[PDB]
C-alpha cells in the first residue's frame, strides 16, 4: 500500500525514511498523489518531461504548493522570464563568477583559521553555513559584522517558503522583508550615484533591448539571489562532507588525487539535493505518465527522488565520487536551471579542497551518529555536524 505521507509537511523531509517513500512512488505510481491529493513527479523521466513542457507545467502560479506567485524570475514564464533572466545574468557570467575564485578562497581560509587550533568544530555552524553567506554578502555590500543579521532574515524567509506559517511567523517574515527592502534600496541609490563593481552596480547597469531592471525588480531579484546564496549550498557542503567522512575510502581517494574533486562535487550535489521540490501549475488537464492531472492544480518536482532513480543512477544509495555520468537534477533542468549553479559549484570546490588539505584527519565525533535534518518542505539539510581533527596553526 502507498506510504501515508504529506509532501507539504516539513517533517517528511527531515525523515530518513523519505527515500523509502520515494522508492515506492517510483515503482508503483511515478506521478504520485499524497494523502491530501497533492501531485508529485517522483521519477527522473517525469521530472525531465515536465521541465521540458513549460507551457503545460508553468511557474507563473508560484513555485510553492500553498502560496501565490511573487514578482521574480523563478515565478515567471517565457518570454517575460527570459528577459528578466538575461538582465540578471549580467551578474553571473562565466567570467565574472570564475573571477571570484581568489576572494572565495580567502574566505575559506579565514573560516578554517578560526577553528583549526581547536581540534573540534561544528562543521555546519563554523564552515558550511558561513562561507556561502560571506560570499553572497560581500557581493551585496554587507559588512562582515552584519552577516548574521542577513542570515537570520534569510532563515525566516526560507522558513516561510518551507511551511505554512502562523500569524506571528508571518509578521516576522514581513518584518524581515521590510528590513531587506530598506537596506537594498539604500544600496541601489548609492550605486546609482557612485557605481562600483559589486552586484547591485552590475545589475543597475544591465540592459537588454532597451530594457533595464526597475528598483522593485532589483529588490526582488537580489533577494532571490541572497537566499540562493545563503540557504542552499550550505547543505551540500555539510551533507556532502558527511558522506566523505562516513565512507572513508571516498575521503582517502580525494586526498590522494585532487583531479577527482569535480566529480566529487557533483556526487555531493546529487546526494544532498538541498532543494527538495519546486512546484508547477497545470495550464490544462493532462494525462501525465499514467496520472490524470487537472488544470490549475500544482505538481511538485521531487528532485531528491529523481537523483536516486535507479533508472538513471546505478546503485543510487552508493555514494561514489567517481560516478560518471552524473546528470543529477539538484539544480533542476531547462528554462529555470539554477542561475547560481556555477557560483555554488565554485564555493563547494574551494572549501572542500581546503578542508581536505588543512583538516586531513577530519572525522565525525560519533561515526555512528544519526544527525538531525531541518524540518522544512522546500530546502533542507543538516542542523549540526560535530567534527574533530588534529589542530594546526592558522595561515
Ligand atoms: C547548491 C546550491 C543550489 C541549489 C541546489 C539550487 C537549486 C535551484 C533550483 C532547483 C532551481 C529551479 C530549477 C528548476 O525548477 O528547474 C534554482 C533556481 C535559481 N537559483 Fe538556485 N540553487 C542553488 C544555489 C543558488 C545560488 C548560489 C544562487 C545565486 C547566487 C541561485 C540563484 C538562483 C536563481 C536566480 C534561480 C532562478 C532561475 C530562473 O528562474 O530562471 N541559486 N536553483
Ligand atoms: C513576501 C515575503 C517573501 C519574499 C520573498 N521570499 C519569501 C517571502
Ligand atoms: C523564492 C524562490 C526560491 C528561493 C530559494 C532558492 C533560490 C535559488 N536557488 C534555489 C533556491 C527563494 C525565494
Residue numbers in the entry: 3 to 397
Article excerpt on this structure:
The first step of cholesterol degradation in MtbC27-oxidation of the cholesterol/enone side chain―is catalyzed by a 48 kDa cytochrome p450 enzyme (P450), CYP125. − Cyp125 (Rv3545c) is encoded in the Mtb intracellular growth (igr) operon, which is widely conserved across actinomycetes and is essential for Mtb survival in macrophages and mice.
As CYP125 and CYP142 have a similar biochemical function, ,,, fragment-binding profile, and binding mode to 1a (inferred from UV–vis spectroscopy), we hypothesized that a structure of 1a in complex with CYP142 might provide a suitable surrogate for CYP125, and help guide the development of dual CYP125/CYP142 inhibitors. A 1.7 Å X-ray crystal structure of 1a in complex with CYP142 was obtained by soaking fragment solutions into CYP142 crystals that were prepared by sitting-drop vapor diffusion. Interestingly, the structure revealed two molecules of 1a bound per enzyme active site: one coordinated directly to the heme iron via the pyridine-N (1a-i), and the second located near the entrance of the active site channel (1a-ii). The aligned structures indicated that the binding mode of 1a-i/ii to CYP142 could be accommodated within the conformation of the econazole-bound CYP125 active site, and enabled the identification of key active site residues that differed between CYP125 and CYP142. UV–vis spectroscopy also provided detailed understanding of the binding site and orientation of the fragment hits, which helped guide hit-to-lead optimization chemistry, and enabled us to use the co-crystal structure of 1a in complex with CYP142 as a structural proxy for CYP125.
